[PDB]
């Protein structure tokens, strides 16, 4: 035991927990000045004693050197896309198609309804609680190594907030820029004659493609997790909402507007409640993602591959 290693461990613990309280809960226990006080007290102490500097410390989010290019990562589990509806009738058709396809339809059919954030899909790997790599969705099978960029997102934890983390956990989410940060970014790009982005999705997309993480750190990017990929050394919950609640409990940011619904009539209430709220949310959304809440029924219904919307193989029994 040393005095310095005791101070760094205690500071890092307090700060990672204060980041969790501000970012994930929107309920900080201390003012932003108390957080910074401990933050630059830790950073100064880590430079005075470089021997005890850790890779996943909250002071080490940004890399000092810009990268040569972007590597190629292929997704272990492929990253799935989404089918889309445009009317109450079209949504109700997708629902009847599932009621008639199920071996046993339960009473009621629970759905996990979330907003369809207008951002970029990314992967984040957590090997024994530590962020080892992050990748863009790319084509759904092969993406780019954007780890340095993903490490700069203030609400993306560099370490999971659990003493028993899984062996490997791939968090999957949507990276986006909120309205306030977007407004700020254009006004700064106007007063310094630089690129202005047409909307917050292009602003976030461009910020994540920057080779220098010192530029990405200055962009107000935000992660909201929508699912899990690799899951080793853990027994994940039997429903989608419980898995999202589980991600939140170990340090991962999820959307707060996600609610459960029983049957298409309740699910259509959520679509129109979120539609009124759209005009005063603080970030862009282009609809809602409505999901079957039970993981047994997901594996039962399964997935479609790259196929037409105008052709169906009515298979024989």
Ligand X SMILES: CC(C)(C)c1nc(-c2ccc[nH]2)c2cc(C(N)=O)c(N)nc2n1
Q: Enumerate binding residues for ligand IWH (CB under 6 A).
A: 18-19, 21-22, 28, 30, 32, 35-36, 154
Provide the minimum distance between the beta carbon of 258 and ligand X in the complex, in angstroms, as a whole number.
Answer: 8
- Alpha-carbon distance of 125 to 79, in angstroms, equals 13
* Partner from ligand IWH, a copy of itself, ligand X, none binding residue 174, C-beta < 5-8 Å depending on class: ligand X
* Partner from ligand IWH, a copy of itself, ligand X, none binding residue 168, C-beta < 5-8 Å depending on class: none
CA 26 to chain CA centroid, nearest Å: 16
Centre a 10 Å sphere on the Cβ of residue 143 and count the other Cβ atoms it contains.
22
How many residues in the shown chain lie near a copy of itself by CB under 8 A? 51
Q: For residues 36-63, b (16+ Cβ closer than 10 Å) or e, as one string?
A: eebbeebbebbeeeeeeeeebbbbebeb
109, 121, 225, 264: which one contacts ligand X (CB under 6 A)? 121
315 is in an annotated binding site: yes
* Nearer of residues 178 and 227 to ligand X, judged by Cβ: 227
By CB under 8 A, what part of segment 120-149 binds a copy of itself?
140
291 is in an annotated binding site: yes
81 is in an annotated binding site: yes
Q: Residues 273-302 vs a copy of itself: string with x where CB under 8 A?
A: --x--x------xxxxxxxx----xx--xx
* Partner from ligand IWH, a copy of itself, ligand X, none binding residue 144, C-beta < 5-8 Å depending on class: none
- Alpha-carbon distance of 14 to 38, in angstroms, equals 8
Q: Return the DSSP state at 51.
A: G
- Alpha-carbon distance of 1 to 6, in angstroms, equals 7
Query: Do 160 and 129 meet the contact criterion of CB atoms below 8 Å apart?
Result: yes
Phi-psi region of 240 (alpha: psi -120 to 50; beta: other; left: phi over 0): alpha
- Alpha-carbon distance of 43 to 37, in angstroms, equals 10
* Partner from a copy of itself, ligand X, ligand IWH, none binding residue 101, C-beta < 5-8 Å depending on class: a copy of itself
3-state secondary structure of 174: strand
* Nearer of residues 11 and 258 to ligand X, judged by Cβ: 258
CA 135 to chain CA centroid, nearest Å: 12
Query: Do 294 and 110 meet the contact criterion of CB atoms below 8 Å apart?
Result: yes
Provide the minimum distance between the beta carbon of 137 and ligand X in the complex, in angstroms, as a whole number.
Answer: 5
Q: Report the catalytic residues.
A: 116
What is the binding site for a copy of itself (CB under 8 A)?
A: 78, 80-87, 89-91, 93-94, 96-98, 100-101, 116, 140, 271, 275, 278, 285-292, 297-298, 301-317
């Amino acid at each position: 035991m040393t005095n310095i290693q005791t101070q760094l461990d205690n500071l890092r613990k307090t700060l990672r927990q204060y980041e969790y309280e501000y970012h994930v809960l929107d309920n900080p226990s201390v003012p932003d000045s108390e957080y910074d006080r401990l933050f630059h007290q830790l950073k100064a102490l880590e430079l005075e004693h470089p021997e005890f500097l850790t890779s996943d410390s909250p002071t080490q989010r940004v890399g000092a050197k810009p990268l040569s290019g972007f590597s190629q990562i292929r997704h272990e589990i492929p990253m799935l896309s989404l089918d889309n509806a445009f009317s109450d009738a079209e949504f109700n058709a997708f629902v009847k198609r599932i009621e008639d396809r199920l071996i046993l339809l339960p009473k009621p059919l629970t759905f996990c309804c979330e907003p369809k954030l207008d951002g970029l899909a990314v992967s984040i790997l957590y090997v024994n609680g530590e962020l080892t790599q992050a990748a863009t969705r790319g084509d759904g099978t092969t993406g780019e190594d954007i780890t340095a960029n993903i490490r700069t997102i203030r609400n993306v934890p560099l370490q999971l907030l659990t003493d028993n983390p899984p062996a490997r956990l791939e968090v999957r989410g949507e990276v986006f820029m909120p309205h306030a940060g977007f407004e700020r970014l254009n006004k700064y790009a106007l007063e310094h004659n630089e690129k202005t982005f047409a909307n917050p999705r292009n602003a976030a997309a461009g910020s994540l493609r920057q080779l220098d993480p010192n530029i990405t750190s200055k962009r107000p990017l935000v992660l909201n997790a929508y699912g899990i990929g690799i899951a080793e050394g853990v027994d994940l919950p039997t429903t989608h909402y419980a898995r999202l609640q589980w991600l939140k409990s170990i340090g991962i940011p999820v959307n707060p507007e996600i609610r459960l619904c029983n049957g298409a009539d309740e699910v259509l209430g959520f679509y129109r409640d979120i539609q009124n709220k759209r005009s005063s949310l603080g970030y862009d959304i282009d609809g809602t993602v409505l999901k079957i809440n039970d993981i047994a029924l997901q594996n039962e219904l399964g997935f479609i591959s790259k196929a037409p919307r105008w052709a169906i193989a009515y298979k024989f029994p």
